[PDB]
């Protein structure tokens, strides 16, 4: 009866969730119709769909998600596609006009209209959940309705519901590859105002997944579709300790006590161990003792960042499938004897382990192979400080000639907060070099 | 035996039986409905309780966790320290197989006698294809 | 079954013995191990059914039919 | 006739203590239905100690089962012997503790322990003569280490003069499975020195290595370590239920083994551990069980007992044995290595011989040690709490809940007390 709200705003997060919600219906028995099969039994206990789906007595199973976007064309293809008979037709909130890479077009001007139809579903969704535990938001930093509009939910949901952890998963802008011309601008605006209300905001990158899919999967010329089912498997391994059973169950209340040491050092990043194609995953032994070491590569990180320039602070190794807990324990002690994986002095423990009894799933027509085990580490490293070095220097050249500004100030937004959002992200960056001082 | 081959051949294939446990001979005994799952991937058995509305029981979904079920124990296994050790293949003479679950027969698991009265359409087809058994009629 | 009892004063366990009363410890313990294996009377203050339709005879000869 | 109350808090204590009843009911002849099928007539005559008999003969246990996260009491009722308990005895909320000490003893614990102590009282009245309390602590965090001392500091307010029997899994020198582990340890040993009369230490490191070189397992899961714990746990209370030749209850085991008031943390063991291979290549008697008992590799707590002495050692005995064999072979072991005991008291061995062996053997024993080496197990948490403290690491999930900071030095100052007391008398 432990529940989770899954809000998908922006245009990236409504598109990941097309590939995220096909996976929960796949883990359990629920058809894209929404009904359950008459003949085939998947094996499901009785309430393991209780976390993400609200079963109704008519037989249909109804999901807990809100898909709001102000530009209408991306939810209108979910309103017509394979997953029409799944959702609630009042969930899918349609706007009228763009947000158009503008922070102030989505956060203040057009955002003041659509917000009360957004919140009057969330405060209805909470009243049917009797064991509610937190939020799972899906947006993107480099835009105008996943950046401006995420901090219009976050500065109201924190006001109403108070202290409940909120776990937003955002595509970080990549170093070399970039699409919008103004994403150094609207990145800083959505982290000055959401670092005060976030509890752990995970980071995903487009450039890193474009390379580990090139080599491990050994696919080439990839798409956006082949990226969304690698982000759909992380979040279905985070939320597997609320629907399944196992030795160590790490549920959502203590992700702030395991991963957040100081109240503004909550920016962790995640990987996933056995990503092998179907021609090489049967040609070697994939056991516990090496997929816990393939997690600690430089080349297996979902964020383009060298982990080796900063020391780890707290990990979390959420295992899955056929794992006995002796094999984890001799394998973590392999890690701390290595003088490359540098842990740091005020945290002798560092590691935190969960095990479970359900193997990985595979989508039909998938890119991944059938594997018994799965590891999804989540690490709070200090190397992500110099992922914020570049994106302040990107801000520091365009603001240095007042460039690109007047599309922001025209749509109800003061110029006075550009200087103090970059005053802020110094004061965020000054903390990571302060905590590393032993 | 290639455990990975069995897993890959029978992944998500579960035989589902409908059973009653008639305990009415006990002082507070009730005739109760159960679902028996047999997992073809690993030859494990799970027993689920069927709760009716207003049955006066605590809503626990499982009578028995998913595990491999011994049918016959070795004579020396009477002294096996079950309080510290799990039953290994050395203490078990015969394991429960898919052949032992038959509609209209009593099935004795952990000292409880279940009467299997029906099976799902998939299980019915699987028994026809694997064992050549004629149609398994539901018992009222 | 002779010598199926317990002495008066045995601290220990005997089943079905919290649930039987009225006789001392050995007589109860034998029970606790075997279990482990014509007309009515005048001026009576009770009710004969049919006692609206009787006239003109004796309480003895009118309550005989109730027991026979 | 002399009953003991059992209490199950935390994750690690719920699961080991539910493996405790499948060893208890195995010795006495209860099938998982709950009715009685046993052969020997010596099981019945003292069945009342751990069990309550119910109308029909469904011998129901005497444990109380409290945890906040309800996912484990839906997971220990669903075991092989889970279906025997009292469903009135299950107490829970819905908000898990989250490995926080101030979610157990302070904030949510002000709700539920007012409804914990009146389910204890509903079975204290059905006991003829209570003498003790079992609790399965779990020191690895704040779900069974925080609110465990919320119960024993409330029970000890009620019953001043009764035995406390806590079996608590202890933190480990290896890499742990919780990052706030030195925080939550030192909070809960400030009160365990004031309300318990022993705290039988257990380490997951030693139980991965008893089963590595002696038993020689291949893949020891969590289902196998609990048999090692529950065998010692069921060996200490044998003189209460089974007839014996020197009978020793839990107060007989008290005045032997605590010299000064604050030296009661002990060390467990279990004698006849063999491989699956070399069982019939080995002959066991009293003088072979003694060498299997008195080595550092047969201790269930990850300390090396050759860096200290023993104040008092007791080894209960089960089976059909003589007692010149027992006593003279405890005289040799106090004589062959006499520099590993304390000179200021002459004798060091308490002997108790029962007349009933366990299932599947012909003789067994159980080793209980009170060493000075336990300060090494307390030196580490004294050493790795300080480095997590002076930078105020990981901290505001306590102080932001109901903690203070003035008791984070008033618990370390008592951690380093026990290191001083064990060492001073060495």
From Swiss-Prot, chain A:
For whether the record's keyword set contains NADP, the answer is: no
Gene it is expressed from:
Tuba1a
Q: What is its EC number?
A: 3.6.5.-
User: Out of the domains of life, which is the source?
Assistant: Eukaryota
Cross-referenced SMART domains, in alphabetical order? Tubulin, Tubulin_C
* PANTHER family recorded: TUBULIN (PTHR11588)
User: Primary place of residence?
Assistant: cytoplasm
Question: What is the recorded function of this protein according to its Swiss-Prot or TrEMBL entry?
Answer: Tubulin is the major constituent of microtubules, protein filaments consisting of alpha- and beta-tubulin heterodimers. Microtubules grow by the addition of GTP-tubulin dimers to the microtubule end, where a stabilizing cap forms. Below the cap, tubulin dimers are in GDP-bound state, owing to GTPase activity of alpha-tubulin.
- Identify a single GO molecular function assigned to this protein: structural constituent of cytoskeleton
Catalysed reactions listed for this entry: GTP + H2O = GDP + phosphate + H(+)
- Sites bearing 3'-nitrotyrosine, chain numbering: 282
Q: Which residues bind Mg(2+)?
A: 71
Q: Report the enzyme's class at the first EC level.
A: hydrolase
**GO terms (BP aspect):** adult behavior; adult locomotory behavior; cellular response to calcium ion; centrosome cycle; cerebellar cortex morphogenesis; cerebral cortex development; dentate gyrus development; flagellated sperm motility
Its recorded name reads: Tubulin alpha-1A chain
**Subunit structure, per the record?**
Heterodimer of alpha- and beta-tubulin. A typical microtubule is a hollow water-filled tube with an outer diameter of 25 nm and an inner diameter of 15 nM. Alpha-beta heterodimers associate head-to-tail to form protofilaments running lengthwise along the microtubule wall with the beta-tubulin subunit facing the microtubule plus end conferring a structural polarity. Microtubules usually have 13 protofilaments but different protofilament numbers can be found in some organisms and specialized cells.
Coiled coil (residue ranges): none
Disulphide connectivity of cysteines: none
| Catalytic-site annotation from UniProt | 254
Q: Which residues carry this modification: N6-acetyllysine?
A: 40
From Swiss-Prot, chain B:
**Which proteins does it associate with, and in what oligomeric form?**
Microtubule inner protein component of sperm flagellar doublet microtubules. Interacts with the C-terminus of CACNA1E. Interacts with alpha-tubulin.
Q: Which residues of the full protein are shown?
A: 229 to 368 of 648
All copies of the DM10 domain together span: 11-131
Q: What does this protein do?
A: Microtubule inner protein (MIP) part of the dynein-decorated doublet microtubules (DMTs) in cilia axoneme, which is required for motile cilia beating. Microtubule-associated protein which regulates cell division and neuronal migration during cortical development. Necessary for radial and tangential cell migration during brain development, possibly acting as a regulator of cell morphology and process formation during migration. May enhance calcium influx through CACNA1E and stimulate programmed cell death. Overexpression of EFHC1 in hippocampal primary culture neurons induced apoptosis.
- Tissue/organ expression: Expressed in adult brain including hippocampus, cerebellum, cerebral cortex, thalamus, hypothalamus, amygdala and upper brainstem. Expressed in soma and dentrites of pyramidal neurons of the hippocampal CA1 region, pyramidal neurons of the cerebral cortex and Purkinje cells of cerebellum. Highly expressed in testis, trachea, and oviduct, moderately in lung, and slightly in brain. Highly expressed in sperm flagella and tracheal cilia (at protein level).
Tell me which domain of life the UniProt entry assigns to the organism this sequence originates from: Eukaryota
Species the sequence originates in = Mus musculus (Mouse)
Swiss-Prot record, chain C:
Q: Which cysteines are joined by disulfide bonds?
A: none
Tissue specificity note: Expressed in airway epithelial cells.
Q: Where in the cell is it found?
A: Cytoplasm, Cytoskeleton, Cilium axoneme; Cytoplasm, Cytoskeleton, Flagellum axoneme
Give the residues annotated as coiled coil. none
Q: Where is the signal peptide?
A: none
Q: How does it assemble?
A: Microtubule inner protein component of sperm flagellar doublet microtubules.
Q: Which family is this sequence assigned to?
A: Belongs to the CIMIP2 family.
Outline what the protein does.
Microtubule inner protein (MIP) part of the dynein-decorated doublet microtubules (DMTs) in cilia axoneme, which is required for motile cilia beating.
Q: What is the name listed in the Swiss-Prot or TrEMBL entry for this protein?
A: Ciliary microtubule inner protein 2B
Q: Which organism is it from?
A: Mus musculus (Mouse)
Q: What is the lineage of its organism?
A: Eukaryota, Metazoa, Chordata, Craniata, Vertebrata
Gene encoding the protein: Cimip2b
Swiss-Prot record, chain D:
Q: Tell me which residues bear Phosphothreonine.
A: 55
Q: Which InterPro entries match?
A: Beta-tubulin_BS, Beta_tubulin, Tub_FtsZ_C, Tubulin, Tubulin/FtsZ-like_C, Tubulin/FtsZ_2-layer-sand-dom, Tubulin/FtsZ_GTPase_sf, Tubulin_C
Family annotation (SUPFAM superfamilies)? Tubulin C-terminal domain-like, Tubulin nucleotide-binding domain-like
Biological process, per Gene Ontology = flagellated sperm motility; microtubule-based process
* One GO CC term on file: axonemal microtubule
Q: Which Gene3D superfamilies match?
A: Helix hairpin bin (1.10.287.600), Tubulin/FtsZ, C-terminal domain (3.30.1330.20), Tubulin/FtsZ, GTPase domain (3.40.50.1440)
Q: Which cofactor does it need?
A: Mg(2+)
- One of the record's GO molecular function terms: double-stranded RNA binding
Q: What is the protein's known function? A: Tubulin is the major constituent of microtubules, a cylinder consisting of laterally associated linear protofilaments composed of alpha- and beta-tubulin heterodimers. Microtubules grow by the addition of GTP-tubulin dimers to the microtubule end, where a stabilizing cap forms. Below the cap, tubulin dimers are in GDP-bound state, owing to GTPase activity of alpha-tubulin.
Pfam families given in the database record: Tubulin (PF00091), Tubulin_C (PF03953)
Q: What is the lineage of its organism?
A: Eukaryota, Metazoa, Chordata, Craniata, Vertebrata
The protein depicted here goes by the name Tubulin beta-4B chain
- Predominant place of localization: cytoplasm
The gene it comes from is Tubb4b
| Note on domains (UniProt) | The highly acidic C-terminal region may bind cations such as calcium. The MREI motif is common among all beta-tubulin isoforms and may be critical for tubulin autoregulation.
Entry keyword annotation includes Ribosomal protein: no
State the family named in the UniProt similarity comment for this chain. Belongs to the tubulin family.
Residues annotated as binding Mg(2+)? 69
